């Protein structure tokens, strides 16, 4: 009980809700020297773990012919701006099967709504 | 190591336990009372008691789900028709445990598990 | 060696002994090869021998390691003389002199 009231103060209420399997645009902060700037990450989300302040989601992309995936925290100050570019249409929560086949043959159709 | 775990073992496999509680729950609701061992009756409350909760509201979708359990048309027919209206005003506590000593064959703790209403 | 610039320790020590090879043991045991003794010398040294001796090699830069003495090479035990007609090898080969 007393633990539960702690997160709501530390929560932020501006994160949008997105379906698993959508194309997500995220601007992630980076620290170097004294300059603190944005880095752009383009990719499709393949997993959603929305649990408390530590809600997490995994973003996967293909760069230079190889696949790279990254996990995030929705309620972390590291991420500043999160946007959805293309809304995918997949009827499965976890999209872990994208690693097996190539991305070029694994395009996801739009939700059409 | 059973830390914060629920659900006993009963020297039976997962399929056998599902069949165990499927037949036992149907027997209890049909005869309004059954005699079984003390832990089995306690674990049956996790199965038979939720059945009335789905039977509190009568609908085709709920009846089909209730039919998926207890695998019997007679059992589900009794539900949603007679158990529902009688247990509508009660939230939980649909059954009670009445221990009746030990068996003469294996020294097993029996308990008379029955519905609390018991036809008044 | 860069740090050394004289032959002061060499007047102190006129004899250098390499590690003698361990003898063979039971259970088909082979002795370890004797550790190679390395001598730290200032750069630019020249070494001369007797009996119509000559120079071995000029040192001009640090890091050059020169082979001066070859240790003797190990002998053979009775097991290597395994055969059917002998069937009891009491022969062994003495180690080569250093």
């Amino acid at each position: 009980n007393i633990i539960k009231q702690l997160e709501q103060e530390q929560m932020k209420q501006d994160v949008p809700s997105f379906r698993p399997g959508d194309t997500v645009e995220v601007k992630v902060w980076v620290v170097e020297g004294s300059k603190k700037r944005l880095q752009a990450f383009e990719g499709v989300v393949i997993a959603i773990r929305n649990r408390g302040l530590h809600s997490a989601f995994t973003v996967r992309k293909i760069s230079n012919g190889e696949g790279v995936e990254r996990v995030f925290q929705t309620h972390s100050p590291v991420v500043d701006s999160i946007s959805v570019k293309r809304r995918g249409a997949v009827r499965k929560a976890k999209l872990y099967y994208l690693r097996e086949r190539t991305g070029k043959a694994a395009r996801i159709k739009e939700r059409l709504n | 190591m059973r830390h914060r775990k629920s659900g006993r073992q009963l020297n039976r496999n997962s399929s056998h336990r599902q069949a165990m509680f499927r037949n036992m729950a149907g027997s209890l609701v049909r005869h309004e009372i059954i005699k079984t061992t003390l832990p089995k009756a306690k674990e049956l409350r996790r199965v038979v008691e939720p059945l009335i909760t789905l039977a509190k509201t009568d609908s085709v979708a709920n009846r089909r789900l209730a039919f998926a359990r207890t695998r019997d048309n007679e059992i589900v027919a009794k539900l949603f028709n007679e158990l529902g209206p009688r247990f509508a005003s009660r939230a939980g506590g649909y059954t009670r445990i009445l221990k009746c000593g030990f068996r003469a064959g294996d020294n097993a703790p029996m308990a008379y598990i029955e519905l609390v209403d018991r036809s008044e | 060696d860069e740090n050394l610039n004289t032959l002061i320790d060499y007047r102190f020590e006129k004899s250098f002994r390499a590690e003698r090879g361990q003898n063979g043991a039971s259970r088909d045991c082979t002795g370890k090869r004797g550790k190679d003794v390395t001598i730290k010398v200032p750069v630019g040294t020249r070494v001369i021998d007797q009996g119509t001796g000559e120079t071995m090699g000029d040192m001009t830069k640090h890091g050059q390691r020169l082979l001066v003495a070859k240790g003797g090479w190990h002998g053979l035990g009775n097991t290597r003389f395994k055969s059917s007609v002998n069937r009891t090898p009491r022969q062994k080969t003495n180690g080569t002199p250093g």
Binding site: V30, E32, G33, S34, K35, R37, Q39 | - | -
Partner: protein, 102 residues
């Protein structure tokens, strides 16, 4: 501190025989490096002498360099000043690598 530190290093490295300097803008291409400045040295001694000088003055310039690369080898040495990166090089090994589109 972008152009201020950029102008702070190019003039002073030139006073220490800094030849063939190229000012490169990498903004929008890399998220780790801001400006690529290239310096050339005659041989191993020259590039090492300027490398120690630029890090010695940086200690008295307030900002702390985040690392060095040249150890027991002058083939490639590069040191950082935070937002700006400085590459001090020699003639022979520069053409071996690629120039001015990093």
């Amino acid at each position: 501190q972008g152009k201020a530190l950029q102008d702070f290093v190019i003039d002073k490295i030139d006073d220490l025989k800094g030849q063939d300097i190229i000012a490169l803008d990498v903004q929008g291409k890399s998220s780790i490096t801001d400006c690529m400045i290239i310096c050339t040295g005659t041989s191993s001694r020259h590039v090492m002498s300027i490398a120690d000088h630029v890090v010695q003055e940086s200690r008295a310039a307030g900002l702390l360099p985040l690392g060095v690369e040249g150890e027991n080898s002058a083939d490639w040495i590069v040191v950082d000043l935070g937002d700006v990166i400085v590459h001090v090089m020699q003639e022979e090994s520069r053409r071996l690598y690629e120039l001015e589109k990093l």
